[PDB]
Amino acid sequence: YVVGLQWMGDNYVFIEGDDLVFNKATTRFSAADLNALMPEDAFPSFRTLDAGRGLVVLFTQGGLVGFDMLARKVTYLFDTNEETASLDFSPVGDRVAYVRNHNLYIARGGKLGEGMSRAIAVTIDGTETLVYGQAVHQREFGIEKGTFWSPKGSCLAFYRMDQSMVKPTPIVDYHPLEAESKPLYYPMAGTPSHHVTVGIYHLATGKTVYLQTGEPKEKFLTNLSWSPDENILYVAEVNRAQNECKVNAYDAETGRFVRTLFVETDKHYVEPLHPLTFLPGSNNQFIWQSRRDGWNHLYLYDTTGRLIRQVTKGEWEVTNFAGFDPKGTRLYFESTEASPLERHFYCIDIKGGKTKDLTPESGMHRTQLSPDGSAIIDIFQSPTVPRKVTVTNIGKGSHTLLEAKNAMPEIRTGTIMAADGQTPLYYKLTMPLHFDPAKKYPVIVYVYGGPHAQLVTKTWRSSVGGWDIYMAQKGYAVFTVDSRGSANRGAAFEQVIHRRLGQTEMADQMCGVDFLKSQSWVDADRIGVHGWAYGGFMTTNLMLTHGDVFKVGVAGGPVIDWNRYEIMYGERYFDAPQENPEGYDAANLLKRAGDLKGRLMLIHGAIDPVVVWQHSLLFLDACVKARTYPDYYVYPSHEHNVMGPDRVHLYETITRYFTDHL
């Protein structure tokens, strides 16, 4: 990454230590010039709010400074009471919503000099048991926050989560003299889910209204989408069985149910991940993403509920919807049409038809469509190309903004059949530094395998934070393969795992082993395995299932008993435990601890809210009574992943463990 590249109206900006170089399709702006315009070394970090209007917000000791870049003027001063995590600025740019001590507030931006005004408390009965304005449903179904402003800043929609009926998991903080425990309302598979409702605060009247979403109370309220009109608030409702998704229209004034536009079901599960996105200047048509036909595509609906058409279609998937052209006759997006291993920015006619790849060079393309929808910033990188920024006037020439190119582990890539004998799996093989084919090196299988992830793509070097490359330097070869269940290969490719977590995944992973055994340089007796989270589940499951093949493994934050995983994610792929005993039992690693004959180290972050510590601890417990002997390590200060400098320590631990036992 090189100094935050992005759009500012019709200018594409990027920093330069002390400078913020604005350019087009050219003029600087120093941290100094900026300070000159402030009230009270390099260029300060900031969050862009309105790329188009160039409005941004600067974080500074005491309040936030709204600042306009295209007009170099300080917009407003906001006082959030030192709360930044939940900051959600009104689209009008003059107000910001945030959560503080369980409640939702709206601080009004104060003009420079004109004085500040007391923030407004939208709610006042918030609690650790009653959460307001924050992510809900375990951050599934695209939910990343809990506040939603109406297009015109007239209303502020927000979640209200009653989790008082959820038996909590303790999260211990071991730093105080005496350790302190805070409860974590983590709803486990099969247990009563939390109860969510959507409230709507009207800035004008200060009046609040909750959508009459009805019963059952556990209904999953996802993807809130306001109407450009602000009269309707759309909600993508999903049932507990997660096999039905009703998109409903709600009266934002009264909260009354208006009607169901459309419903979509699926044999295994439906999983809405994006809001409705209306066409520019339209209040009757909107684009909706669906994976209904086995591939995520863009559909053009009409607020009546009538499907006008499926804009994109094919055995590939849209991996990001960037938007439209000013008129709204073309849709821009990122997809795997070129290859499951690549990402290209496209552009298709709103009427459908052929798509035009705008970033055809083989590799990974991460593109940013400009505001005026004309130009395009493109950051590319392939196995051969480290990076290559390319601002482009859609139509004109493609002025390159930056190009680069660089003993190291040889990385090989190939394909192999999955355990079904027909499905093509992709793998990346990191050869040991100073590889000598005369030799017989030890190999470690790095594995995730779970849904929503794809590890093998045409990128630059590693795609696992460089752990593979680290290990390769210590003499071990690392191998990864996106087994069935992995992402971006279509619904059929993924859903095969339904109700049978771990089964096909391992069957496919063993095909990755056969491949490795086919290499002369592969020492079939020194095969290891490593993984985190879902990869932890796999690493352990593999060692207990194929104790003869894998000698050593290290499993971080491993899911051991899926009955203890969250309702939302867990139930989608496994279904409730009461309705699928055999599936759950086959994956309950606690039941097969006695099969641990090799050397395995579980690693966990004590205050982990994703995969509760209990998982790895209970495994150890099962081992004590089954008389098996795993190893262990705990990071008391970390949650799910060890981030920051501590990661040097994590890598050192994981690595040394293999150099010690593999």
The least CB distance from residue 165 to a copy of itself, in Å, is 13
The least CB distance from residue 636 to a copy of itself, in Å, is 4
631 binds, among ligand GA0, a copy of itself, none (CB under 5 to 8 A by kind): a copy of itself
Closer CB to ligand GA0, residue 11 or residue 138? 138
566 binds, among a copy of itself, ligand GA0, none (CB under 5 to 8 A by kind): ligand GA0
Region 613-652 residues binding ligand GA0, contact defined as CB under 6 A: 640
For the record, the structure tokens of 144 come out as 């990343």
| CA 97 and chain centroid, separation | 23
SS (H, E, C) 285-323: EEEEEECCCCCCEEEEEECCCCEEEECCCCCCCEEEEEE
Per DSSP, the three-state class of 49 is strand
Q: Does 177 bind a copy of itself (CB under 8 A)?
A: yes
Binding ligand GA0 (rule: CB under 6 A), the pick from 112, 610, 618, 626 is 610
Which positions ≥6 away from 208 have C-beta within 8 Å?
Answer: 122, 199, 200, 201, 202
Q: How far is 418 from 511, CA to CA, in rounded Å?
A: 6
Closer CB to a copy of itself, residue 193 or residue 486? 193
Size of the site for ligand GA0 (CB under 6 A): 12
Q: Does 244 bind a copy of itself (CB under 8 A)?
A: no
Bridge partner list, 413: 428
Name the nearest CA neighbour of 546 among 583, 499, 510.
Answer: 510
635 binds, among a copy of itself, ligand GA0, none (CB under 5 to 8 A by kind): a copy of itself
Region 567-626 residues binding a copy of itself, contact defined as CB under 8 A: 606, 612-614, 617-618, 620-621, 623-625
Region 260-319 residues binding a copy of itself, contact defined as CB under 8 A: none
The least CB distance from residue 638 to a copy of itself, in Å, is 8
Bridge partner list, 607: none
Q: How far is 66 from 56, CA to CA, in rounded Å?
A: 6
In sequence order, what DSSP letters do the residues of 192-261 get, joined into one string?
PPPEEEEEEEETTT--EEE----SSTT-EEEEEEE-TTSSEEEEEEE-TTS-EEEEEEEETTT--EEEEE
Q: How far is 232 from 248, CA to CA, in rounded Å?
A: 10
Q: How far is 471 from 464, CA to CA, in rounded Å?
A: 12
For the record, the structure tokens of 398 come out as 């493609």
Q: Residue 259 to residues 150, 191, 222: CA-CA distances in angstroms?
A: 20, 30, 16
The least CB distance from residue 469 to a copy of itself, in Å, is 21
Four-point Cα dihedral 435, 439, 440, 443, nearest 10: -10
Q: Give me the numbers of helices (H) and strands (E) for the chain, helices first please.
A: 9, 41
Spatial contact of 482 and 426, defined as CB atoms under 8 Å apart:
yes
Size of the site for a copy of itself (CB under 8 A): 43
Q: Does 191 bind a copy of itself (CB under 8 A)?
A: yes
Q: Does 179 bind a copy of itself (CB under 8 A)?
A: yes
Binding a copy of itself (rule: CB under 8 A), the pick from 60, 169, 319, 519 is 169
Spatial contact of 497 and 538, defined as CB atoms under 8 Å apart:
no
The least CB distance from residue 163 to a copy of itself, in Å, is 13
Sign of CA dihedral 75, 73, 7, 374: positive
Q: How far is 344 from 362, CA to CA, in rounded Å?
A: 8
Closer CB to ligand GA0, residue 300 or residue 611? 611
Closer CB to a copy of itself, residue 24 or residue 649? 649
Q: Considering just the CA atoms, what is the radius of gyration of the chain in Å?
A: 26
Binding a copy of itself (rule: CB under 8 A), the pick from 365, 564, 572, 592 is 564
From residue 503 to residue 542, the character string flagging contacts with ligand GA0 as x (rule: CB under 6 A) and all else as - is: ------------------------------xx--------
637 binds, among ligand GA0, a copy of itself, none (CB under 5 to 8 A by kind): a copy of itself
Region 129-158 residues binding ligand GA0, contact defined as CB under 6 A: 138-140
Q: Does 566 bind ligand GA0 (CB under 6 A)?
A: yes
Q: Does 631 bind a copy of itself (CB under 8 A)?
A: yes
Region 390-429 residues binding a copy of itself, contact defined as CB under 8 A: none
Closer CB to ligand GA0, residue 12 or residue 534? 534
10 binds, among a copy of itself, ligand GA0, none (CB under 5 to 8 A by kind): none
Question: Which positions touch a copy of itself (CB under 8 A)?
Answer: 167-170, 172, 174-175, 177-181, 186, 188, 191, 563-564, 606, 612-614, 617-618, 620-621, 623-625, 627, 629, 631-637, 646, 648-649, 652-653, 656
Question: Which positions touch ligand GA0 (CB under 6 A)?
Answer: 138-140, 450, 452, 533-534, 566, 568-569, 610, 640
